[PDB]
Design a protein around this ligand. Sequence first.
Ligand SMILES: CO[C@@H]1[C@@H](n2cc(-c3nc(Cl)cs3)nn2)[C@@H](O)[C@@H](CO)O[C@@H]1Sc1cc(Br)cnc1C#N
Ligand SMILES: CO[C@@H]1[C@@H](n2cc(-c3nc(Cl)cs3)nn2)[C@@H](O)[C@@H](CO)O[C@@H]1Sc1cc(Br)cnc1C#N
Lengths: 134, 134
Amino acid sequence: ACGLVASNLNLKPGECLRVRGEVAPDAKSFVLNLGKDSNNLCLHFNPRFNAHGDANTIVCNSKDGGAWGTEQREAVFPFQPGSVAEVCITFDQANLTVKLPDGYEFKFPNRLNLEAINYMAADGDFKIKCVAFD
Amino acid sequence: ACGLVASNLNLKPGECLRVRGEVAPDAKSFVLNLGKDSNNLCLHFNPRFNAHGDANTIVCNSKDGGAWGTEQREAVFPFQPGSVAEVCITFDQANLTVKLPDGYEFKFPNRLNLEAINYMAADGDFKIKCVAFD
Ligand SMILES: CO[C@@H]1[C@@H](n2cc(-c3nc(Cl)cs3)nn2)[C@@H](O)[C@@H](CO)O[C@@H]1Sc1cc(Br)cnc1C#N
Ligand SMILES: CO[C@@H]1[C@@H](n2cc(-c3nc(Cl)cs3)nn2)[C@@H](O)[C@@H](CO)O[C@@H]1Sc1cc(Br)cnc1C#N
């Protein structure tokens, strides 16, 4: 975790986390992690421009006691090298809902049953401009 | 800090950090810490409504290897219990500049000669709602 790390977030079900940043002009990939701590992530949100054998694909996963879950890939890639992008995340007992920069929404299943999200971390080719907590 | 803790901020000289939060309805005092880590703070920003023998006074200090420096007190207190408040902070080699909710500005000397601020923490009667980087 070499980008921003925030802890003690106490983000509750139905509350909105908003992250705005600028995608690097030569971006390969970037990451937003949410969960309890670095080893227990309800969401690893990983847009891949050209990385790990994916092109223009969002890969999401969970991490439970340091172990990756099953990957989920999306049908849409509303990111552009160089461009500002905002991502909004909420959750309930069943899913996280991720709203992307073109307003497209997808759900990622809530695997860890967290009562609250206490940890967020950013990494890769995305410079954070702001974060809002409900 | 029961409040938000952020690390890897990489805030550079001349960049503006904007922190917006909610002052608790019955607020006694709150803290914003900036520096290298919890033991090495270029700014401990401590508005005291009624705490530690101060009434409606901003106390600022530095912390160097765990040691509190010489306290600085301000003549102005533009905070109200049960309100939103924003503080904006920048620095150079000589001083931090703190801009308060009514636009009042004061300087606090840069005693640790930090060339980046990597650590922020909130504590006490203030819930961080938003953080912006320039
Ligand atoms: C390559 O690693 C990635 C992981 N990764 C990316 C990053 C970073 N990117 C930046 Cl930017 C900064 S840090 N850190 N770890 C992660 O995205 C994971 C999600 O399932 O996929 C593969 S590992 C993996 C997991 C499973 Br399940 C199956 N196959 C593979 C692979 N390959
Ligand atoms: C009381 O403690 C405070 C310190 N403090 C406040 C908090 C918190 N407030 C919240 Cl809300 C959450 S955590 N934690 N530690 C700090 O503000 C310090 C600044 O100089 O003054 C005194 S200690 C001190 C330092 C010096 Br130099 C001289 N006298 C004293 C005292 N007393």
